[PDB]
Amino acid sequence: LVKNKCVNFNFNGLTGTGVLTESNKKFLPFQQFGRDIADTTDAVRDPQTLEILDITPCSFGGVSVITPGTNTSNQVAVLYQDVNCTEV
Amino acid sequence: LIANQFNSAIGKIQDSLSSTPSALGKLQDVVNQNAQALNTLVKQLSSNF
Amino acid sequence: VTKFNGLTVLPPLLTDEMIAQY
Ligand SMILES: *[C@@H]1O[C@H](CO)[C@@H](O)[C@H](O)[C@H]1NC(C)=O
Ligand SMILES: *[C@@H]1O[C@H](CO)[C@@H](O)[C@H](O)[C@H]1NC(C)=O
Ligand SMILES: *[C@@H]1O[C@H](CO)[C@@H](O)[C@H](O)[C@H]1NC(C)=O
Ligand SMILES: *[C@@H]1O[C@H](CO)[C@@H](O)[C@H](O)[C@H]1NC(C)=O
C-alpha cells in the first residue's frame, strides 16, 4: 500500500489514478465504492483492511510565464496554478 | 428627526436582510447557475454518446 | 450566500478583503 503519492490504483476494478490519504469518513460495512455529487469515485475501502482511502486527483494546473517586456529584460517567473510546490 | 429616520431605516435593512431567505436572490441564482452548469458538464462524461 | 476533471477555478485577483477595503 502506497499513500500520499500519486499512483495508478486498481482495487477490484476501480482502474483509476490519484493520491490516496487516510479518510475520516465512515463507510457502511456493505459499502465499498465512494462517490461525490458529480458521481466520480471519491473514496475506496481497502480490500485487505478496514481503512478508508480518499482519492484526490493528481495535482494539475496551468503554467503561466510572468515576464516583463523583452525590451526591458529577459528574466521570467513561472506560476504553477493551484499546485503545492512540494511536488513541482 | 432625519437622523433617527436614517438610523431606523438602516436597522430595518439589517433585519429584513436577516429575515427573508431570498433577499440575495440574484447573487444566489448566479452562483446556482454556474454550479449547475459545471455539474452538467461533469455529468456529461457519464454519457455513452 | 452559500469534481476536478480538468476544471480549474481561478481565484479572483481582488480578494474579498480588498473588495471590502475598496
Ligand atoms: C489481513 O490483512 C492484513 C493487512 O495488513 C494482514 O496483515 C493479515 O495477515 C491478513 N490476514 C489476517 C488473518 O488478518
Ligand atoms: C519597452 O516597451 C514598452 C512598450 O513599447 C515601453 O512602455 C517601455 O518603456 C519599454 N522599456 C524600455 C526599457 O525601453
Ligand atoms: C503544501 O503541503 C504542505 C505539507 O506540509 C502543507 O503544510 C501546505 O499547507 C500545503 N500548501 C497548500 C497551499 O495546501
Ligand atoms: C449608532 O446607532 C445605531 C442605531 O442604528 C446603533 O446600533 C449603534 O449602537 C450606534 N452607535 C453608537 C451610538 O456609537
Chain B contact for C5, CB < 8 A?
Answer: yes
Q: What's the grid cell of residue B47?
A: 454519457
* 8 A C-beta contact, residue C1 and residue B24: yes
| Rounded-to-10 torsion of CA A50, A41, B28, A60 | 110
Q: How was this structure determined?
A: cryo-EM
Does ligand 3 come within 6 angstroms of the Cβ of A81? no
Task: Return the ligand 4 atom nearest residue B11 CA.
Answer: 5
Ligand 2 within 6 A of CB of A69: yes
Given the DSSP bridges, would you call strands A63-66 and A52-56 parallel, antiparallel or unpaired? unpaired
Q: Where are the beta strands (DSSP E) in chain B?
A: none
Q: Are A65 and A78 in contact (CB under 8 A)?
A: yes
- Resolution attained, angstroms: 3.1
Centroid of chain to Cα A4: 9
